Amino acid sequence: TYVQALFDFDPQEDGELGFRRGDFIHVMDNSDPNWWKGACHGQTGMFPRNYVTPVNR
């Protein structure tokens, strides 16, 4: 399952996943309706669900 970032996300907080608009993120945990865990750029972390869109579509 991959999602595409629709916006840049540049967190300060540890445990949060950073990415740029257009990046593809491998979703690791989408159980919570608001914060998902994903993998990108050699790291994993949490990010707000509404920053990304499903690639399958």
């Binding site: 629709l6 916006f7 257009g22 499903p54």
Partner: protein, 69 residues
């Protein structure tokens, strides 16, 4: 609705500029409206969604919205 991202409108959009070539109907946006996306690609400037503040559907410039947090 479905398992798609939601956006909060921060800038109004009343159809100007219109969707390129009128490929689809424009979606009126008011600051504060929450739009549930139906079609979106990072590389594209025009996204489709359902404005849940008005229950209307259409296309709008992605530069008028940001993630609903």
């Amino acid at each position: 609705g479905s398992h798609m991202p939601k956006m909060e409108v921060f800038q109004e959009y009343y159809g100007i500029p219109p969707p390129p070539g009128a490929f689809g109907p424009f979606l009126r946006l008011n600051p504060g409206d929450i739009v549930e996306l139906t079609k979106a690609e990072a590389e594209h400037n025009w996204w489709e969604g359902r404005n849940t503040a008005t229950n209307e559907v259409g296309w709008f410039p992605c530069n008028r919205v940001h993630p609903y947090v």
